[PDB]
Amino acid sequence: ANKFKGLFGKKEMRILMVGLDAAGKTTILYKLKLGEIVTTIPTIGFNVETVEYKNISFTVWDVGRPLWRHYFQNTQGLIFVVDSNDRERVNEAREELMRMLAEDELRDAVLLVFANKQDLPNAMNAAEITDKLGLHSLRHRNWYIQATCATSGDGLYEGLDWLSNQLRNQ
Ligand SMILES: Nc1nc2c(ncn2[C@@H]2O[C@H](COP(=O)(O)OP(=O)(O)O)[C@@H](OP(=O)(O)O)[C@H]2O)c(=O)[nH]1
Ligand SMILES: [Mg+2]
């Protein structure tokens, strides 16, 4: 029994999940067990991973283009995954997140931040990640931060349940 397959209602739901390389995004995709990850290379050096099961679709790429903006406009949910143990690159994660949120095509996207790798000893917790990313500053933005360990699965249901509920009841 796959807990994610009935988590997104029955209407079309499109989610874009991005983040710096090594944040844990591909790990999350596999954990959903929603089918084969299809990799496309729309242009050399731009790798896109897609998972689709019935009404739910995840699109994934690393950050850090015209095609990006066409992916944006159809995006209802935006997930930003961050390596909570990588203090050296947390500011870079912030700048990439803020760059995406400045895009008009994502103006109405609901934002879920996965503060990933919470299993590691010296990982910043979700409150610290919230402050380092400046999420309290966000304007006209429906956002949530969820502590996760993608390799164990902890937190993934909780975050996606929050996001799905927001998308289905608004
Ligand atoms: N400790 C820990 N590691 C995690 C967690 N999530 C992902 N990882 C690990 O981090 C590395 C990068 O994950 P990946 O999903 O490839 O990230 P990406 O797709 O965002 O680039 C992988 O290890 P490798 O590259 O070494 O195989 C993966 O196993 C987590 O919650 N905790
Ligand atoms: Mg990857």
Residue numbers in the entry: 6 to 69, 75 to 180
Extract from the study:
The ADP-ribosylation factors (Arfs) constitute a family of small GTPases within the Ras superfamily, with a distinguishing structural feature of a hypervariable N-terminal extension of the G domain modified with myristate. Arf proteins, including Arf1, have roles in membrane trafficking and cytoskeletal dynamics.
There is only a single monomer of [L8K]Arf1 in the crystal asymmetric unit, with residues 6–180 visible in the structure; in addition to residues 2–5, part of switch II (residues 70–74) was too disordered to be modeled. The macromolecule is clearly bound to a magnesium ion as well as a guanine nucleotide that was initially thought to be GDP, but was later determined to be G3D, a GDP molecule with a phosphate in the 3’ position. Another difference between the structures is the interswitch region, which in the [L8K] structure moves approximately 2.4 Å (based on averaged Cα-Cα distances of K59 and N60) towards the cavity compared to the WT structure. Examination of the location of the L8K mutation revealed that this residue, while located inside the hydrophobic cavity in the non-myristoylated WT structure as L8, is instead found outside of the hydrophobic cavity when mutated to lysine. Interestingly, the N-terminal shift as a result of the L8K mutation is also achieved by redundancies in the N-terminal sequence of Arf1—while the hydrophobic cavity in the WT structure is filled by residues F5, L8, F9, L12, and partly M18, the cavity in the [L8K] structure is instead filled by F9, L12, F13, and M18 to a greater degree.
